[PDB]
Design a binder for this molecule. Structure first.
Ligand SMILES: Cc1cc2nc3c(=O)[nH]c(=O)nc-3n(C[C@H](O)[C@H](O)[C@H](O)COP(=O)(O)OP(=O)(O)OC[C@H]3O[C@@H](n4cnc5c(N)ncnc54)[C@H](O)[C@@H]3O)c2cc1C
Ligand SMILES: Cc1cc2nc3c(=O)[nH]c(=O)nc-3n(C[C@H](O)[C@H](O)[C@H](O)COP(=O)(O)OP(=O)(O)OC[C@H]3O[C@@H](n4cnc5c(N)ncnc54)[C@H](O)[C@@H]3O)c2cc1C
Ligand SMILES: *SCCNC(=O)CCNC(=O)[C@H](O)C(C)(C)COP(=O)(O)OP(=O)(O)OC[C@H]1O[C@@H](n2cnc3c(N)ncnc32)[C@H](O)[C@@H]1OP(=O)(O)O
Ligand SMILES: *SCCNC(=O)CCNC(=O)[C@H](O)C(C)(C)COP(=O)(O)OP(=O)(O)OC[C@H]1O[C@@H](n2cnc3c(N)ncnc32)[C@H](O)[C@@H]1OP(=O)(O)O
Lengths: 443, 443
């Protein structure tokens, strides 16, 4: 056939769905409704623009609504879809431009509305120099504030947030990091968080841990931050405390949520309603180690969701087959890579789990420049089964993490990892790869 | 028990064996006889000493005979084992110190004699500024010649050789590369050799291809190199044309050679004689893609041999389970990694094989500094089974090659690679990893 595919949201999942569907089947009418007035941009890059490394914000968009148009795809920014007359029985789609509101129908509907910041309840959040880092507009806001220092407080020592810390220091601010749990990167085992505390500290960041924030001081302006542990003075504050999925519209039309709260999906990205798909951060994914659904709001997973929905609609054969949880981020001079489950998580799930954590190099002892390289393996006591892993390096790669993600994907034991014929040469690895050394193999 | 382990050769295979056995069972009498007067050093490092980047040649050794002694291991350099009275029936081991010759016995024998340069029959090789890069003493000889320029010819455009060209340019010389076959790195598909020709050229290296060397001109000094394509003036010439294993003493004792010419072995590194193992460059290894014995003289495989033999002897349970051929080297601003089979070799072996070759980046389009990244996949037509692949980057690393090595290890298809959840973030990968892009996925 040659019918009508409506994409709600156009950031990553949504743009992927649109771009792939129209390529795979040029008969479709493909329309994207984005509320934000930008479309198809790398949120991941926002801290590099903040920091000054990337000169202009527009650098971050992959495709313009104009290039889209050239390619058969009609994108509307600043259009919010306010209601769907689903099943029910499509029309559906009332939505809003500049001035007006109006109707549309669809044959295939891709929900790709993303995630919004998850705001803690703290009096004084509403003030003038409290910010959030999610969108292009967020970037504009911030980018205005920044030059004109002086003192920043960042709530949340998650990856973005560690990422913001570096950006603000690169922009000359003094920065203190506040975290309610005891370590930075609290969702991973503590050795890694340690490494990070030391690197933040080396670069002038103050890291307050185990800290209850009580309010943001000011008369609508923000100058403080009052905490259980004292008062942090700050004319800019960044809330970096989580995101939650944008599910509200999809519940209105009776799309089912999964246990995570994100929209449920099958290997075809299809929801519970016929003709409705979801993609990207509003959607659950099957975690392959946990053997259940999971929310993993990463941008590469959004692209793989989007592209699967896209292909499926264009009548190609395409399945999405799940995640293992691999992430990497850059914080100052560390590259921090995780995958699978941390020992704590492994334990919480009931495994009889053990961890090893080793410190190697990134190149021969004798090689000029060779840096430290840590690897963590989390495994199942008896079986040897791999459950998760971390590698940290200065390295632009390592990224060695990818090998673990590979193994986690099938069952994959410590034994299997030992048997792997990895690449040796003095500039890149010691003669035993740090993954091999960590395998069984020292403690 | 508490018997006597004798290791002939003490470079990498040999050293690993000795060190692992003594640790694993301290009751062993462990003695190493090395002919070369150095022991336990990184030949792979030699070009970085050549180039000046690593200041002194001793920086390459990992353990001194002294530190070994402290750890229960007796090493003798400048000791050649000249005969073995095998089975036969051990005394065996007549060998030679400084002055003397003498007898020893063994209960376990590890043959780790390595490999020697494989010289093409060329009149005038015997002269004064012709050199080879294999040993610590080779390193001395060249380090003497180097400062004092002026014109270098390298025969052979293998990894050492490309490695040498870089070293020599960093040391001021003009360098011309002479290769008999049509490409640099003739052993791999040609895309890769091409990228290297361009890099070599961009750094001042002249690269003569399809070139028959006829002889080394001079009166016992060398100043030329006469070739089917003209005359290359050269006061220093590096022969970098292959190695062959040192199987001579082992044949004398009736140890069996494999079809490769290297010593045959089992998963326990045991030879055909009871009590006799081999480790390192003298030893074959089972290739897991080709499902037969293979020669893969790399230093990481030597450590893996060595440590297996070692363990086995101290009566730990240990097995070596083959290789897949993964290698990586650095030539100027390229890191070049291959694994499995090139398409050529794939086809020689009779697979219905195809290849894909793609060029991506190492980091988001918008990220500062992101470089190119290429990836080659070699696969079976129908099944989708991976057969080999290459990745080249500037990257320290990528090294992504390890993922393929991983997959090659189990059967592993292009499909499987596709399903992998790798790590995305702007500094390190585009949002589709270049492995993923390559997979089915563009041509
Ligand atoms: C600072 C930062 C750094 C990051 N770094 C990384 C990294 O290093 N690696 C990585 O893999 N990921 C990273 N991410 C994650 C990235 O933002 C997402 O995971 C990815 O872009 C997936 O997006 P998506 O299309 O599902 O939706 P989102 O990017 O959440 O966007 C959906 C858009 O659709 C719109 N929409 C919502 N409701 C409606 C409606 N009712 N009608 C019409 N339109 C609507 C929204 O306004 C929104 O802008 C980072 C994110 C941030 C914020
Ligand atoms: C310039 C250069 C660069 C390299 N780069 C890399 C790289 O980037 N990555 C990688 O994986 N590999 C690399 N290698 C490979 C490395 O040399 C070997 O593959 C590795 O060290 C394995 O060694 P082995 O112990 O089996 O024996 P070898 O290293 O060949 O040494 C065994 C030693 O035992 C001695 N011996 C021999 N016969 C007798 C006898 N009859 N009695 C007593 N003693 C004896 C020899 O004199 C010799 O020095 C490189 C090599 C060179 C030369
Ligand atoms: S914060 C996380 C990041 N978020 C974002 O990426 C937001 C922006 N991205 C997007 O909006 C989508 O990713 C877009 C760009 C809309 C989707 O783009 P397309 O789906 O059109 O994808 P591409 O233009 O990247 O190309 C897709 C096809 O092109 C082949 N290909 C890509 N790159 C290469 C290289 N380097 N060499 C050879 N071929 C390449 C891909 O294989 C793909 O092929 P198919 O034809 O789809 O199989
Ligand atoms: S050109 C190719 C390279 N050639 C060479 O390597 C030549 C020189 N090398 C050698 O001679 C051998 O590799 C030597 C150094 C003699 C062998 O040394 P050992 O066998 O004693 O090995 P190590 O001292 O490296 O230690 C082995 C045990 O130590 C554990 N371990 C290593 N590194 C770490 C780090 N960074 N963090 C924690 N643990 C570490 C190894 O796992 C290994 O453990 P065991 O299981 O006890 O052997």
């Amino acid at each position: 056939m040659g019918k009508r595919m409506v994409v709600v949201g156009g950031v990553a999942g949504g743009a992927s769905a649109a771009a792939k569907a129209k390529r795979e089947n040029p008969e479709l009418e493909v329309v994207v409704y984005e509320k934000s007035g930008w479309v198809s941009y790398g949120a991941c890059g926002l801290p590099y623009v903040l920091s000054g490394e990337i000169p202009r914000l527009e650098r971050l968009v992959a495709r313009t609504p104009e290039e889209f148009r050239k390619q058969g795809v009609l994108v509307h920014t600043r259009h919010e879809v306010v209601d769907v007359d689903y099943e029910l029985r499509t029309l559906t789609v009332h939505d809003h431009a500049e001035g007006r509101t109006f109707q549309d129908r669809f044959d295939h509907l891709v929900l790709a509305t993303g995630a919004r910041p998850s705001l803690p309840p703290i009096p004084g959040t509403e003030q003038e120099g409290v910010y959030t880092l999610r969108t292009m507009e967020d970037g504009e806001r911030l980018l205005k504030a920044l030059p004109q220092a002086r003192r920043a407080a960042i709530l949340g020592a998650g990856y973005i947030g560690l990422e913001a810390a570096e950006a603000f220091r690169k922009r000359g601010l003094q920065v203190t990091l506040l975290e309610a749990k005891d370590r930075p990167l609290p969702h991973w085992d503590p050795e890694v968080g340690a490494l990070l505390k030391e690197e933040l500290e080396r670069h002038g960041v103050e890291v307050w841990t185990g800290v209850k924030v009580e309010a943001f001081r000011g008369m609508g302006r923000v100058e403080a931050v009052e905490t259980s542990e004292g008062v942090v003075p700050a004319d800019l504050v960044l809330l970096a405390t989580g995101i939650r999925p944008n599910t509200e519209l999809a519940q209105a039309m009776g799309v089912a949520l999964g246990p995570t709260g994100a929209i449920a999906t099958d290997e075809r990205m299809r929801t519970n309603l016929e003709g409705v798909y979801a993609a990207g951060d509003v959607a659950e994914s099957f975690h392959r180690v946990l053997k259940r659904p999971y929310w993993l709001p990463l941008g590469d997973v959004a692209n793989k969701h989007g592209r699967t929905a896209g292909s499926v609609i264009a009548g190609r054969e395409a399945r999405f087959l799940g995640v293992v949880g691999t992430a990497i981020f850059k914080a100052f001079d560390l590259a921090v890579a995780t995958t699978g489950l941390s020992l704590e998580g492994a334990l919480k799930e009931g495994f009889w789990a053990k961890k090893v954590f080793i410190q190697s190099r990134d190149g021969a002892h004798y090689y000029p420049g060779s840096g430290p390289l840590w690897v963590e393996l989390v495994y199942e006591e008896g079986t040897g089964r791999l459950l998760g892993g971390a590698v940290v390096a200065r390295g632009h790669g390592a990224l060695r993490i990818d090998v673990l993600a590979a193994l986690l994907h099938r069952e994959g034991s410590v034994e299997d990892l030992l048997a792997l014929d990895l690449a040796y040469a003095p500039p890149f690895s010691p003669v035993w790869d740090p993954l091999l050394i960590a395998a069984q193999q020292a403690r």
